[PDB]
């Protein structure tokens, strides 16, 4: 699997009605874990996938970020802005996560909003993003 396969796999989410596939998300995460040397390009792509995917697929884009983000987080526990590090990838995600969350919520139906809220809670408990960032979104968008 090379970077073009990663692009193609992410792009294939357009053909899922729900925008969600556990096995495909795992495939993207395994790729992200195996190519941390190019995390900057991977993280840019999944950020931009969340920005550009259809409204009903926003939730799935946050699941992609959940899976890669927490997979990267679990590695950091075993330089904040050195390209090629899990830490930098997570900082990059965190700098855009408020934008991505508030747009996802605005475009989500009620059931997806509740699933986004629980994802917010998971991110709070797991330490993936700053609690301040997350609580801020919780107050403004819900």
């Amino acid at each position: 699997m090379d970077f073009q396969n990663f692009v193609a796999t992410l792009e294939s989410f357009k053909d899922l009605k729900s925008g969600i596939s556990g096995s495909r998300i795992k495939k993207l995460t395994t790729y992200a874990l195996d190519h941390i040397d190019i995390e900057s390009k991977i993280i840019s792509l999944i950020i931009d996938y969340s920005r550009l995917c259809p409204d009903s697929h926003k939730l799935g884009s946050l699941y992609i970020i959940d899976s890669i983000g927490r997979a990267y987080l679990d590695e950091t526990r075993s330089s904040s802005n050195k390209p090629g590090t899990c830490a930098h990838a997570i900082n990059t995600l965190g700098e855009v996560i408020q934008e991505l969350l508030s747009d996802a919520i605005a475009k989500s139906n009620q059931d997806h909003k509740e699933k986004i809220r629980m994802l917010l809670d998971i991110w709070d408990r797991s330490g993936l993003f700053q609690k301040s960032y997350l609580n801020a979104i919780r107050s403004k968008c819900f």
Binding site: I20, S21, G22, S23, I25, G60, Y63, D66, S67, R70, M118, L119, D121, I122, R125, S126
Partner: peptide, 11 residues
């Protein structure tokens, strides 16, 4: 083929 969320951060 849904996305399995982590129970240790849910319950």
């Amino acid at each position: 083929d849904d996305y399995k969320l982590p129970m240790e951060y849910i319950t």
